[PDB]
Design a protein around this nucleic acid. Structure first.
Lengths: 185, 62, 100, 66, 142, 57, 144, 75, 141
RNA sequence: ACGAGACUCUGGCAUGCUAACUAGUUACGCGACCCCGGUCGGCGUAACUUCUUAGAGGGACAAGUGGCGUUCAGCCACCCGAGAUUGAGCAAUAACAGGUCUGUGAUGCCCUUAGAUGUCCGGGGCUGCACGCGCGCUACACUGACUGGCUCAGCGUGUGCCUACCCUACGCCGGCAGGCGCGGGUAACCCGUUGAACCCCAUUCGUGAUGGGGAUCGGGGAUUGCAAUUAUUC
C-alpha cells in the first residue's frame, strides 16, 4: 500500500502534538512512518540528524542498556511491540498518541548548571532526549528483580506519564529537576 | 506567573564553565517586538522554539 | 598436451611482466592460450613486540609478506614449452611447470 | 581543513604563467592538460593542482592577481 | 521467448544478496524458501518494504530468486531488501521505460535511501593496546 | 621434490637462505669491500653474485 | 487440578532431611545431599512418575518407590558412571551415598589421607587449598 | 527483607476469586494476576490456559517472553 | 503441491516426529532416557521422547544438504559450553547420540550411505517427507 | 633544509577492461519428489563474469551553487554522487645516567675457571600464604537461566634440513572425554558451503542466594609425556 503506513498495525495518522515547541523534533508523522522501528541507522553521523529519526526507533535504541542488553535491538523491538498492544488493551487510546503525550509531560523545561549554579532552560532536542531517557530508565528500575516483565513496566509508565500520574519515575525526576532549577534561579 | 513561547532568531556563542550552555538571541512568538537574550542547555538549531518558565530573566551578555 | 604453468612471486609487477611475457611467446606460437588465472593472494602476518626487553609502552609490529600466484595452462607438447620457459625470467619470480 | 600547501600552490602558478591559453575553466579538462604539461607522480596531486588552477581562473577574469 | 533476466547484487556489512529477475509470474524466494517465511520473523515487514510500497502488481510479471552468502543474520535481511529493490528497478530500465522506473525509485529513496545505495560501513581493524578499534586497556597509576 | 613443503614455507626458506649468506659474507669479505649479494634462479643451478668493491681482492 | 488437592505433605521428611512440597518434584529431591539436578532426573525417569507435579501432590505410596532407587540404583538399570561413589577404596562397590552417609564417608577419606601422612591429607589438616591453587593472593575470608 | 510467600496451588477461596474477577480485567498477564492473587508465575501461567479453553479470556498475543490476555467481547 | 522448504521448520520437525510415532520402528537405544545430549549440556532434555524429535531434525538436515557424517552433526547440534568461571566456548555435540539416529534411519530405510562418505536420504525417504509438508501446508489453508 | 603534507598499505565505487575445469552464475539435457510448474550443495555439458578472485585503469578536487570573509587564504550550507574528514604505517632537531650486558659468535673493564660462577645428570624450587596493591575472567538474574527447535560469519593455520612431532573428512566402539579403522590436504583443490556463538522460535521455572552464581571439595574415567603427587589438561 503506497497510501497508508501502519506501525505493524498502528496508524501513524490522527496523532496531534499539542505542545508546539516539540513538533519539530518528534519524527512521528507523514514522512517518518515505518513498519519497523529498526532501521539501518546513520542518524548519528552529523549533529542534528538525530531529529529525523522516528521516535519509536529512538525509544528502541535507548532500551539496549546496562551491559548484557547492549546490541540486542531484536529483543527491544519485541519489547516495544508487545508494550504497544498492552497500552492499547489498558487505555484504548492509540499507542503512538500515548507515547507522544508522555515525552511531552516528562521533558523538563528548566535545568540548573555550573556557571553557585544558574538555572537555564533546555533546548527542545535535549528535552526530548531527556524525556526518552527518564521513561526508559524508569521501566528498567521497575522490571529489575520483579516478576513483572519489561514489557508491562514500560507500558504503564508511559501510560502514567501521559497523564503525569506523579508516580512515574519520569515525572518524579522531571519536576525534581524543575524544582532544583526553580531554587537556584 | 505564565509560561511563554520564544522563537530563536540567532545563536550567539557557547558559554558556561565547561562550554556547556549556549547563548541565543531569542524572540517571543506571542509578540515579536519584545525580544530577549537567554542561556540554553542542549544543542540548539536556528528556528526552534523554547518554553520559558518566566520571561523576565535576561541572561548577561558574554 | 594440457600442461599447467604456475607463476608465484613476491613482487607484483615483476610477476605481472612475466605473467605477460609467457603470453608474448604463446601467441607467437599461435595456439589456444589460457588467461592468467589470478589466485587469491596469501599474506604472512607476524606481529611482535618492538622492544628487545619487556619495558616501555607495549608496542607491536605488522611484518607482512604478501605472496602472489598466477596460473596459465597451455595445450602444447613439451618442447614448445621449454623454449619459452627459458626466456627473460626475473629472480623474484618462481615458475612451476606441470606437464600433467 | 582543506588548505593547499605551497607545493600545490607553487606548481599551480607555474603552469598558469606558462599555459594560460591551453588550460580552461572546468576542473576536468584542465585536469587532463596537467599530466601532459607537468609530470606529476601521484593522482591526488594531479587533482589537487588542477583543483587550484580552476580556482585561479575565476580570480583572473575578475581582475589581476598579484 | 525472450530471456529478460536481470542478475542484480545487493551488499551489506559482509552479506551479499544477488537477486535473479526474469519474465515470470509473481513469485519471490530466497535460497528456495519463500519471502514471508524467513527468520528472524521480527524483520517481517523489512523484506516486505519493496512489495508494500510498490504493490503486488509491480512484481506480477517478474519473478526473483535470491542467493545470499556471508555476513550475519540481519545483514542478510538488509541485503535482501536492497537486492530485490535494486533488481526490480534494474528490470524496468533494461526492458521497459524509465518513466515508470523513475516513478518507482523516488518511492524508495523517499522511504529509505538504503533500498538502493549500499551502506559503506565496515568493521574497523583492532589496534594493539586495547580490546577494540578505539577502546584501550585500563591504565593504572602508582 | 622429496618432502614437498608448501609455498608459504619455501618463500620463507630462501629469505633465511639469503640472510645467512649476507651475514657470512659480511663477516668474511668486508675488508675486501663486500656490498651485498643477489641470487638468480635457474633449473638445478643457483648462481649467486657477490657485488664487491675490489673484485680482484 | 489447579485447585489444591487433599493428602498434602508440605514437608516430606525423607532420608532424615526436610523436603519442600511447594517445589517441583524434580528439584525437591535435590535438597538431599548426594543427589543433584542430574541424578534426580534419572531416578524420576526410572520410576515412571510425571514431573509436571509439585512435591506436595504425589501420593506417598510411591515416594518410597523413589527412595528404594536412591538406596539401590544398580538393579534399577542405572549406569556406574552416575554414582557419586564409584569403586570405593574399601569395598569397591559402586554405590550412591545419600546425605547422611555422604558426610561421614567424607571424613573417612579425609582422615585416611591424614594417618598415612599424605601431602594432600595434611593440606586439609591445615585448612589450605588442596588441588594446587596459588594461595598467595586468594583465600582470605576465613583466614581472618 | 519482606519475602513474598506466593501460593503454588489454588485453594477454593482464591480459585473462586479467579473464575469471577479476572475475566473482567482489561489486561490479563501471568504477571498482573500473580501480583494480585499472590500466586507463583507457573500457577498463573497454568491458570490462563483453561480460561482460554473455557473461553472466558481472549488471547491477544502470546510469546516466549510475553503472553497477554484481555476480556471477551462485551456484546 | 509443496516441498519442505515452503513450510516453517518449527512446525515441520515435530510434525515429522508425529509420523515417527505411528511407525514405532526406530530401533531406539535403552540409554536414551538417561543420557545428556552433549558435554556442554547440564541436564537431560525435558521432553522425554526427544529421540524422535532430533531423529526428525537430522532427517530434514540431510534433505537440504546430504553427505553429512556423524562428525557434521556433532557440529550441527553444538553450542556454548558455559565453562563456569572461565569464558564459554563452542563445543561439539555427542557422537553416539548422533551415530545411533542415522543408524536408526538406516534401520528403517529412509537414508543410505552416500558415496565419498556421509549419509544422503533415499528417494523414497524424500517422497514421504513431502507428505508431511503437504498436510501442514493444508493445515494453514 | 627537515618535520607537517605529499607518500605506502588498507576501506568503500566502477552490469566498463583483462581473465578463470583449484571460483561461480545462467541455460540445456537427464534423475528425485510433490500438485504445465515448484524444489535439489543430485548428476554432465555450451555461453557468460552479476556474484568470487586480482590486475590495469577510472573516480573527489572544496569541483559546482548559495552565503561569509580584505573577497585573498579559506569557512559554512546545499545539489549531484559509492565516498564531500576510513583506518593505520612512516615520522624532525635536541634530550633522558629511561629499559635492555637474562637476545646475540654486539662488547670494554672486573670476577671466576677444575673441589668451577663452565657443562651435564637426578630431585626440589620458581606456584610455598597472617596481609597490601595492579591487569583480568565469571557473576549478582526474568531485557534471565534451563531444554529443545531454527538460522547466518570473516580473519587465518595445517605433514617441519636439525625435527623424531600436522590439519582433518568418513565408518565403527563408548554417556562422555576418548579409542579403532580407512582416506583427503604441502592446501582458492581436503578439513570447509568453515552448518560459530549471540540472536530467533517454543517449553519449564516464578523474585526464593531460586533451575541466580559455580567457588571449594570427594570418588571415578581418559589423553599428552621418560615422569603429573604440590590434583598438566579433559
Amino acid at each position: 500500500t503506497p497510501d497508508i503506513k501502519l506501525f505493524g498495525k498502528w496508524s501513524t495518522d490522527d496523532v496531534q502534538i499539542n505542545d508546539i515547541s516539540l513538533q519539530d523534533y518528534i519524527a512521528v508523522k507523514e514522512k517518518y512512518a515505518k513498519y519497523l522501528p529498526h532501521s539501518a541507522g546513520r542518524y548519528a553521523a552529523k549533529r542534528f540528524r538525530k531529529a529525523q529519526c522516528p521516535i519509536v526507533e529512538r525509544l528502541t535504541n535507548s532500551m539496549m542498556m546496562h551491559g548484557r542488553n547492549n546490541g540486542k535491538k531484536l529483543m527491544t523491538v519485541r519489547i516495544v511491540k508487545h508494550a504497544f498492544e498492552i497500552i492499547h488493551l489498558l487505555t484504548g487510546e492509540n499507542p503512538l498518541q500515548v507515547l507522544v503525550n508522555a515525552i511531552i509531560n516528562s521533558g523538563p523545561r528548566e535545568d540548573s548548571t555550573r556557571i553557585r549554579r544558574q538555572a537555564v532552560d533546555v533546548s527542545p532536542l535535549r528535552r526530548v532526549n531527556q524525556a526518552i531517557w527518564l521513561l526508559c530508565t524508569g521501566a528498567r528500575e521497575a522490571a529489575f528483580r520483579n516478576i513483572k516483565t519489561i514489557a508491562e513496566c514500560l507500558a504503564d509508565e508511559l501510560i502514567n506519564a501521559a497523564k503525569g500520574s506523579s508516580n512515574s519515575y519520569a515525572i518524579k525526576k522531571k519536576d525534581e529537576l524543575e524544582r532544583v532549577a526553580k531554587s537556584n534561579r | 506567573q505564565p509560561i511563554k513561547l520564544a522563537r530563536v532568531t540567532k545563536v550567539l556563542g557557547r558559554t558556561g564553565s565547561q562550554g556547556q550552555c549556549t547563548q541565543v538571541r531569542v524572540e517571543f512568538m506571542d509578540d515579536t517586538s519584545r525580544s530577549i537574550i537567554r542561556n540554553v542547555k542542549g544543542p540548539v538549531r536556528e528556528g526552534d522554539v523554547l518554553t520559558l518558565l518566566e520571561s523576565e530573566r535576561e541572561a548577561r551578555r558574554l | 598436451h594440457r600442461i599447467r604453468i604456475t607463476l608465484t612471486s613476491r613482487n607484483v609487477k615483476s610477476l605481472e611482466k612475466v605473467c605477460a611475457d609467457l603470453i608474448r611467446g604463446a601467441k607467437e606460437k599461435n595456439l589456444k592460450v589460457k588467461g592468467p588465472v589470478r589466485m587469491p593472494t596469501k599474506t604472512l602476518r607476524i606481529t611482535t613486540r618492538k622492544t628487545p626487553c619487556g619495558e616501555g609502552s607495549k608496542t607491536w609490529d605488522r611484518f607482512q609478506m604478501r605472496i602472489h600466484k598466477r596460473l596459465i595452462d597451455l595445450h602444447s607438447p613439451s618442447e614448445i614449452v621449454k623454449q619459452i620457459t627459458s626466456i627473460s625470467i626475473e629472480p623474484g619470480v618462481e615458475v612451476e611447470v606441470t606437464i600433467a | 581543513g582543506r588548505v593547499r600547501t605551497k607545493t600545490v600552490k607553487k606548481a599551480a602558478r607555474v603552469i598558469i604563467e606558462k599555459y594560460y591559453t591551453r588550460l580552461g575553466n572546468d576542473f576536468h579538462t584542465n585536469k587532463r592538460v596537467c599530466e601532459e604539461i607537468a609530470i606529476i607522480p601521484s593522482k591526488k596531486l594531479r587533482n589537487k593542482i588542477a583543483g587550484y588552477v580552476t580556482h585561479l581562473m575565476k580570480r583572473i577574469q575578475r581582475g589581476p592577481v598579484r | 521467448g525472450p530471456l529478460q533476466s536481470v542478475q542484480v547484487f545487493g551488499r551489506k556489512k559482509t552479506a551479499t544478496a544477488v537477486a535473479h529477475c526474469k519474465r515470470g509470474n509473481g513469485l519471490i524466494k530466497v535460497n528456495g524458501r519463500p519471502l514471508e517465511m524467513i527468520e528472524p520473523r521480527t524483520l517481517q515487514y523489512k523484506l516486505l518494504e519493496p512489495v508494500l510500497l510498490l504493490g503486488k502488481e509491480r512484481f506480477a510479471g517478474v519473478d526473483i530468486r535470491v542467493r545470499v552468502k556471508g555476513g550475519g543474520h540481519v545483514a542478510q535481511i538488509y541485503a535482501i531488501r536492497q537486492s530485490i529493490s535494486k533488481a526490480l528497478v534494474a528490470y524496468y530500465q533494461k526492458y521497459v521505460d524509465e518513466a515508470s522506473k523513475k516513478e518507482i525509485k523516488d518511492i524508495l529513496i523517499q522511504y529509505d535511501r538504503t533500498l538502493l545505495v549500499a551502506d559503506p560501513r565496515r568493521c574497523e581493524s583492532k589496534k594493539f593496546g586495547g580490546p577494540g578499534a578505539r577502546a584501550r586497556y585500563q591504565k593504572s597509576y602508582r | 621434490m622429496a618432502v614437498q613443503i608448501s609455498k608459504k614455507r619455501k618463500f620463507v626458506a630462501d629469505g633465511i637462505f639469503k640472510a645467512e649468506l649476507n651475514e657470512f659474507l659480511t663477516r668474511e669479505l668486508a675488508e675486501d669491500g663486500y656490498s651485498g649479494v643477489e641470487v638468480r634462479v635457474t633449473p638445478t643451478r643457483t648462481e649467486i653474485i657477490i657485488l664487491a668493491t675490489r673484485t680482484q681482492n | 487440578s489447579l485447585v489444591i488437592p487433599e493428602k498434602f505433605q508440605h514437608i516430606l521428611r525423607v532420608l532424615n532431611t526436610n523436603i519442600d512440597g511447594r517445589r517441583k518434584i524434580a528439584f525437591a529431591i535435590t535438597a538431599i545431599k548426594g543427589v543433584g539436578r542430574r541424578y534426580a532426573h534419572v531416578v524420576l525417569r526410572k520410576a515412571d512418575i510425571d514431573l509436571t507435579k509439585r512435591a506436595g501432590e504425589l501420593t506417598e505410596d510411591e515416594v518410597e518407590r523413589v527412595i528404594t532407587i536412591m538406596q539401590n540404583p544398580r538393579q534399577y538399570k542405572i549406569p556406574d558412571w552416575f554414582l557419586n561413589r564409584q569403586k570405593d577404596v574399601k569395598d569397591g562397590k559402586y554405590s550412591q551415598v545419600l546425605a547422611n552417609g555422604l558426610d561421614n564417608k567424607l571424613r573417612e577419606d579425609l582422615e585416611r589421607l591424614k594417618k598415612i601422612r599424605a601431602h594432600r591429607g595434611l593440606r586439609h589438616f591445615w585448612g589450605l587449598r588442596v588441588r594446587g591453587q596459588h594461595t598467595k593472593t586468594t583465600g582470605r575470608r576465613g583466614r581472618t | 527483607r519482606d519475602k513474598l510467600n506466593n501460593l503454588v496451588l489454588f485453594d477454593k477461596a482464591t480459585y473462586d476469586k479467579l473464575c469471577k474477577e479476572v475475566p473482567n480485567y482489561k489486561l490479563i498477564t501471568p504477571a498482573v494476576v500473580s501480583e494480585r492473587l499472590k500466586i507463583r508465575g507457573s500457577l498463573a501461567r497454568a491458570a490462563l490456559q483453561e480460561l482460554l479453553s473455557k473461553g472466558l479470556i481472549k488471547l491477544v498475543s502470546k510469546h516466549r517472553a510475553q503472553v497477554i490476555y484481555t476480556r471477551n467481547t462485551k456484546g | 503441491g509443496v516441498t519442505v522448504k515452503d513450510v516453517n521448520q518449527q512446525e515441520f520437525v515435530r510434525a515429522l516426529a508425529a509420523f515417527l510415532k505411528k511407525s514405532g520402528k526406530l530401533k531406539v537405544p535403552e540409554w536414551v532416557d538417561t543420557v545428556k545430549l552433549a558435554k556442554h549440556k547440564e541436564l537431560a532434555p525435558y521432553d522425554e521422547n526427544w529421540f524422535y524429535t532430533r531423529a526428525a531434525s537430522t532427517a530434514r538436515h540431510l534433505y537440504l544438504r546430504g553427505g553429512a557424517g556423524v562428525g557434521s552433526m556433532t557440529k550441527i547440534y553444538g553450542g556454548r559450553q558455559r565453562n563456569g568461571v572461565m569464558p564459554s566456548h563452542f563445543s561439539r555435540g555427542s557422537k553416539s547420540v548422533a551415530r545411533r539416529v542415522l543408524q536408526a534411519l538406516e534401520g528403517l530405510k529412509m537414508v543410505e550411505k552416500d558415496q565419498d562418505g556421509g549419509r544422503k536420504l533415499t528417494p523414497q525417504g524424500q517422497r514421504d517427507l513431502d507428505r508431511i509438508a503437504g498436510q501442514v501446508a493444508a493445515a494453514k489453508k
